[PDB]
Symmetry: D2
């Protein structure tokens, strides 16, 4: 007896609504939009439902305030957050969002403990770790969306320099989703050609590469300062869907995401951005990039950044 | 020498952003997001740009406040509007949006007069008529999105009663996009079966049909009352994209939309909801539904409402 | 634990290979190409496998001669047939293909008795009935591909007359997949407009409608006589995939197909072409079209045709 | 005034039919299937036409034997060939196909000289060179499909070893489409990780890499030996469509193909497999891979094989 695939979206704000829209459009799964705010998920679900016939999709999209309705969810995507964008740092949301995730963890533990959980709520890496701890779900079934967004920005900026299809740029961002994130320039390639070759050919300079690295790191503020009323939500939504696809279709896709890293990158059990393989069993493996000594040091500094914010949370009021 | 297809989105609010998102996802065309509001179109364009690699699309999406950037646009979709939802009737936005569309009309007339123009700005039918007059574009190259949304809702509600795929329901809403809209029950079919047969078979009652017709007419309020911030925007965006697809791909698709009807439905030159054929020459034809006497009367009342609101706009200092 | 969807294609000839190609392209499921001929399914599977990366699909496609490899198949599509096209009638393959289906039934019964079975092997309606009888699978889990092909041809020919998108033509063919098939002109509509209206408007004649009906009935020979080496295989393959999609995605799609009809169309338990609803439980309902007295008589003659060939099979040597 | 995109397929055999099928399914363009064989292109075009409504596509697909019907074609894909698979080497088809391409060249030169031409006919690299000379079309508007197929096989085999999505493997095959083809192991990456790292990590041996390289070179025989009727045709068709997409959508995609290389890889005007950038102006650029001394030597041997076979064609009565 085949059953419809089911994705629960916890938090039906800017990102949550976009996820439902795209999931429905692709007919990837049925969607349950959950929110504590009255009307919001219901209104978005009805609106998106009307669009399904236009897209030729038979996906069902419903809005709810009841955790019983996320029962049997294959994937749970957590977007729930306290209101207002971060001013200077994503960690400003730490204390409030940790408390939200405590409640979300109780819902998931009760109604869909076998779900693959994708966290989006900031500060991403610490929130993922917090959710895994309080929910008690297996490490391989809990991860955070970040690397796909960061790497997509990184790839896009490289692609825009060379004037080529971004899909043909290979580029990874690793470490914590913050100022310390590490766009690994050493393993960048465009159609198989490394950046070192493009430098020799005079088609890109190291300063231009440095600018692209900086642009990747500050990209969230560039979008946020232009939108004014909030942070990015079109690309983060799409990134989460790509991760959900990898799980639901058992793709064995290489997905940069915040995952529990135990025998790689010199760490012994920490949630941080790494290249994973995602399939039907969740996070099934982690790949080891060839990092330069400089990149290894920058990754070390990112790890310190993650541990620092994590310790602040451990000593929360 | 083939050129990239180009869609201009005038107004980068709730609907405009979704249009850019979906157009980019489908790689239907490049997108220019235009708005007078500072930052907004630029922020959304950058955000959506980051998602393009995630979707495997090479569409370019840019934000601007300069009408020179919509030059060479194949399609122009107008969402520009004064802020705030209508309380009781869509015609509350009449005067403000009429003035807005004057500026849009001069922009299109100057920089892309050969564009196919799809209006979304409310009050839809009168705004479409208004834009055509001030812009001077051919009647067949200017239309309004409404019928696709209304008909999609109608199809969805019928489908939900019978428990079937809405794509296999054929159903049209005609007349003005307002309370007087006419969900034509006489031409409803589900996989070839008409409603009259379903009544005889005992699978639906006339009362249930009446409820579906009413639901269709008031559907906009059901969404808006729940969103508690504005009107529907996921489905309206998708509908506009389907209309743009019909044009850009020369589909000869049957598209219910607000079009200039001059020799059908007992009218002699009025913009109202009718079943059109859309291809590379814009609105290429209008189909004549086999309406009952009751439906002809209801359509007459719709035409009166359109004329009434249109005359109020014509009579101003 | 989510598992990959799995389709078994029994017979890896012209149709079988196309099914695997399209299923793989859409990433609808993994495919097992089964055939008794050495090398054929293996070669096609390897070739199609190479294309998967080009389509961005992670579907696995393998070739085999072992029924153990169809274990756990969600859908089984039967294309197996004795060599050579029919000269004048599809029933020429009756005796040989009945024997093939005996063997296929033993494989399915042993390794995937819960599979949804879609028969393509001709003569279609009698082969479907034969397979259900010998396999012992539930009536609702065994059906034949025919109506989607016949109706698609019917819709296409109508669409080509009016110069419109065929997707906007509603048209059904019912009865046995043979000379007696009944293209139901009475329930044809183009964007909601019935043929009777187009006749009054002077846009189509009854003779032109009769030609389209005739063309639909003889379409198989038109393709076959041009191909020379066999019968149609691109459209029949696509039709089967649409049916597989409806089941796997639980679409509740209206699908004309050869199904067990017990309380509709004046029959009390016969496999013939009817409009069905297909979902996760297979054939879940049958819709009753509004047939004219003439159409009811033609359907009666089709039923006689089906019973005649069925009785020939019952008295096979 | 936008026009429908148009692809001409010259030769409606195994590959040509699949190209038409997929192009139509994707609604990438209208298709003209050309062949000298009576009935074949007409039969396939009619068959594929019936499937268009099933796929929700409005692409027109027609069959012909008249070069006047390829007038205004944006892309021309040449599959025309003498019958029968090669026994040991692709160059066995040299003289017969050279004469065939003479007639195709005069057709294209007369009716669509501004078309982007993608050759598939073997022996690929020499046939591409031959067509360019006799047709007189710009070097950048004529290329051959090979690299996409060879690289796709290479990527697939690498992906199968590591158990990952082949889409996340970056890998190039360069040089002539023959035994001398060079799967460039030095620029292989899996999610950013190079093969040298995988060796150090103990996840692959040099012997396994050598096997993959060999498998890639002989892959055509593995398929052909199993098909027992001709050569591969599902993947070659898909590859040609991906190249047509890059052109028609102006993707600026990195496409390994047989292109006119005049200032890269130590050659001064030869058609061979190289990583190109394809957009609306055809072959717009060629990327320079960072090849090892061994790979440079292997590429030199490939260039010799191409020159050898090319000289045999030049020397004829
Ligand atoms: C990691 C990354 O790249 C990235 C990118 C963009 C946004 N984000 C984060 O994603 C989160 C959501 O962003 P957004 O969608 O724009 O925010 P927003 O539009 O404010 O939506 C948040 C939603 O959460 C709802 N909510 C609040 N409390 C609860 C609760 N206890 N249970 C369920 N729902 C609740 C709330 O009603 C609102 O609809 C924020 O924390 C962002 O910082 C992360
Ligand atoms: C016909 C139909 O079915 C339907 C459905 C939903 C919404 N609508 C209408 O569509 C319109 C837009 O809806 P929305 O996107 O939710 O509204 P909203 O999110 O407010 O977006 C409107 C945008 O227009 C911009 N704008 C204002 N003045 C100008 C100007 N002179 N030039 C260019 N841009 C300007 C403004 O900055 C804002 O970003 C409204 O009038 C709605 O009533 C129609
Ligand atoms: C209903 C409808 O619309 C329609 C349309 C087109 C074709 N068909 C029928 O579909 C069938 C297949 O057509 P095709 O693919 O062109 O035919 P073809 O290309 O000959 O393929 C038939 C395949 O079946 C294989 N086969 C033979 N015996 C067995 C067996 N015992 N077990 C497993 N495999 C076996 C055989 O090796 C061959 O590869 C024929 O019976 C056609 O008449 C039906
Ligand atoms: C480069 C590469 O990777 C690759 C892969 C697979 C096949 N191929 C080649 O592609 C070619 C076609 O393969 P196929 O489709 O399997 O072969 P096949 O199925 O025989 O089709 C060839 C078609 O060309 C037609 N034809 C013959 N002469 C002419 C002419 N003068 N004008 C127009 N059409 C003509 C002929 O009627 C036939 O339908 C062969 O040469 C293969 O070797 C190349």
């Amino acid at each position: 007896m085949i059953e419809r695939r089911k994705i629960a979206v916890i938090g039906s704000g800017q990102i949550g609504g976009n996820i439902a829209y795209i999931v429905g459009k692709d007919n990837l799964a049925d969607v349950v939009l959950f929110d504590i705010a009255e009307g919001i998920p219901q209104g978005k679900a009805l609106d998106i439902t009307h669009s399904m016939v236009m897209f030729g999709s038979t996906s069902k999209v419903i809005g709810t305030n009841d955790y019983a309705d996320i029962s049997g969810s294959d994937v749970v995507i957590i977007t729930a957050s306290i209101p207002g964008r971060p001013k200077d740092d994503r960690s400003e949301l730490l204390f409030g969002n940790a408390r939200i995730l405590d409640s979300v963890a109780e819902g998931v533990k009760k109604y869909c403990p076998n779900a693959f959980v994708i966290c989006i709520t900031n500060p991403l890496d610490v929130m993922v770790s917090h959710f895994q701890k309080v929910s008690g779900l297996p490490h391989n079934k809990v991860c955070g969306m970040a690397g796909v967004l960061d790497s997509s920005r990184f790839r896009t900026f490289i692609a825009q320099h060379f004037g080529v299809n971004a899909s043909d740029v290979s580029a990874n961002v690793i470490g914590g989703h913050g100022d310390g994130m590490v766009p690994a320039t050493s393993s960048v390639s465009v159609g198989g050609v490394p950046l070192s070759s493009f430098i020799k050919q005079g088609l890109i300079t190291q300063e231009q590469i440095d600018e692209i690295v900086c642009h990747t790191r500050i990209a969230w503020k560039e979008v946020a300062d232009n939108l004014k009323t909030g942070t990015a939500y079109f690309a983060p939504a799409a990134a989460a869907v790509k991760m959900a696809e990898a799980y639901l279709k058992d793709k064995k896709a290489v997905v940069p995401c915040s995952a529990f890293c135990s025998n790689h990158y010199g760490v012994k059990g920490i949630y941080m951005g790494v290249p994973t393989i995602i399939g039907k069993n969740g996070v099934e493996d982690i790949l080891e990039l060839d990092l330069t000594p400089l990149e290894q040091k920058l990754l070390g500094e990112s790890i310190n950044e993650v541990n620092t914010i994590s310790k602040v949370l451990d000593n929360a009021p």
